[PDB]
Fold cUMP-AMP-activated phospholipase.
Amino acid sequence: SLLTEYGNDNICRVLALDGGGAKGFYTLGVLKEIEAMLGCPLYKRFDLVFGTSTGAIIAALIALGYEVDQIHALYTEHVPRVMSSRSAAARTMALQDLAKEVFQDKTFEDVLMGIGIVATRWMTERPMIFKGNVVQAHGRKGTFSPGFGVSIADAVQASCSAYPFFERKVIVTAAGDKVELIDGGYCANNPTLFAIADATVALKKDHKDIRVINVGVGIYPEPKPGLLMRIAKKWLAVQLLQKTLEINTQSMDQLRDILFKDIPTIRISDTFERPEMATDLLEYNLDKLNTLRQRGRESFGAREAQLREFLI
Amino acid sequence: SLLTEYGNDNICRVLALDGGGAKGFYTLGVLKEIEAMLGCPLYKRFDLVFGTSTGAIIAALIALGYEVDQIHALYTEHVPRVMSSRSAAARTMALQDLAKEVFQDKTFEDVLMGIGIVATRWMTERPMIFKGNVVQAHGRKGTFSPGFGVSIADAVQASCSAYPFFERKVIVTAAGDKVELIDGGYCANNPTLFAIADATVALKKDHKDIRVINVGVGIYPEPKPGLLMRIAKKWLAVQLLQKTLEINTQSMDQLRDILFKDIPTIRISDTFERPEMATDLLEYNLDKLNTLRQRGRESFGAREAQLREFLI
Ligand SMILES: Nc1ncnc2c1ncn2[C@@H]1O[C@@H]2COP(=O)(O)O[C@H]3[C@@H](O)[C@H](n4ccc(=O)[nH]c4=O)O[C@@H]3COP(=O)(O)O[C@H]2[C@H]1O
Ligand SMILES: Nc1ncnc2c1ncn2[C@@H]1O[C@@H]2COP(=O)(O)O[C@H]3[C@@H](O)[C@H](n4ccc(=O)[nH]c4=O)O[C@@H]3COP(=O)(O)O[C@H]2[C@H]1O
């Protein structure tokens, strides 16, 4: 049904997807409406998609040409099960199962658009960004291999490996370098700035010719310690994890606005008074998470006129 | 003794100081040597100083015209006592005592150079940066008040209030807005990028005419859970706090390098195999912390030739 076709212009259209546990049902609600407004799969209209943690799941599926409805079905099938886990080993196994089943043996040579999948290096404590094409590399292009030769499953699993509650994910690059990786949300749970870095620096696009759409997971009432103590034994570490991720997400958006006022950007992550959920790490109740789909469609509707102007 | 005088050029010299508990003895070791190499108090040569958490203590004293030896004496007198606290209430009281005793009733109208003191808004989860002069504001300059009318004590206490282990610090701005603030290290424990944002965007300085010096606290062997379990009851939250702060520090440096390759910058935060310490929150043993002073002087000596070229 997504038969609408678009001409080519010199405008770089960038999509940046936040991480947020199983609450990306909100993200998919926003994306569904953007898809139906365009009349084409998202990879045809967007030049670059960045994602972090469970947002990298969506970003990778978009880059492989999936339609949002297909993404929603896979996301429903696998993401809540990961978050329902209540042991580190169960969480890591659930996540490994998701990665292989969803992405199989696809690689970063298989993508149909620019991509960036953000993880965090345990050793250097700096990001490792799996990319698809050398033209968005900022250096060392003689040794560039798409995705470091790593499969999309391993890159997405790394992006999601929120140690200490998941195991760290060990990777060996095509150049023969072994790296231990953890969740990308520690350095850029909101990956918009990173995506902009590719567009401005690596793709040499002028700020006038960039359109950025950054979709989050939405903002909901924070779980209080009384609830957290009943479901998590390390409740304070669980709360600290959530609060720090939120700060990283919001402060990253403020920094983008400070440094890149002249880059047209729409961020979609509205505040709601329901549902009352656990943290991103722990929430898996599909009855609550499915209502985030509607909330995402509501957030699109509040911005549809400007989104039409961005994406044409 | 600091009698050397320097002419005026159009080069913006920027100093950016990481947070790191009581381990800023390392920072002061680096700064002592920079001071003695210059022959003047740091505020005469530097145009802008940014600091976060215990690094904002040093940055504020530099901005008030203190000499590094004076800063070291105050830092020794008050910072380790804060970190020796083993209850939230004891920590918050120790920190309040430090703020008032060290800075008394000085305000952001009392500074002798540009300053930025970074804290984190609990509500918006975005930075609140206390500044001294409207010319480094990026907007809303009609309502600008130096430091929001807040005293340096309250701004530095806010920058250091690492909730959940300190209480959040309540502030009322000169415009009559009340804000709850926590440690700046949650959004920019390394404040170099923020400082660069002021120099490039707000001060309209060309990248060629900026010199950035970013001093950290150094990198040391990480405490393992066996040790942490013996000194902290919420040891996993304590470890997560340290690891996330480190990632914020190092990833912030990587992002600066990606976005601002053409801004001359020196970062000084070397790796050492001793001393073995607790996390930044918990370490207070002066016998260990005092050896960081020597390590900071060693780190300066490895970069003295290039530091001479930066600062003349
Ligand atoms: N848009 C951005 N926003 C914020 N930070 C960014 C961004 N881009 C890079 N970085 C950081 O800068 C460091 C060096 O980047 P370089 O581009 O200069 O060199 C690249 C490239 O040549 C090659 N390579 C990259 C991707 C791939 O799929 N295959 C592959 O071969 O490896 C190096 C990447 O390694 P890391 O990713 O581990 O480290 C990066 C990252 O920490
Ligand atoms: N260099 C930077 N790097 C990264 N982020 C930055 C930087 N600078 C600002 N921001 C962020 O951008 C938001 C809006 O900044 P604006 O400069 O546009 O307006 C300012 C100013 O007009 C006025 N004001 C500022 C300081 C002072 O001592 N008295 C005073 O009156 O208040 C607003 C500040 O409030 P916050 O600090 O709470 O929010 C900031 C911050 O989140």
In short: The CA atoms of residues 18 and 99 of chain B lie 18 Å apart. The pocket of 3'3'-cUMP-AMP (ligand 1) is lined by residues A 108, 126-131, 137-141, 144-148, 194, 197-198; B 254-255, 258 (CB under 6 Å). Chain B touches chain A through 34 residues (CB under 8 Å).
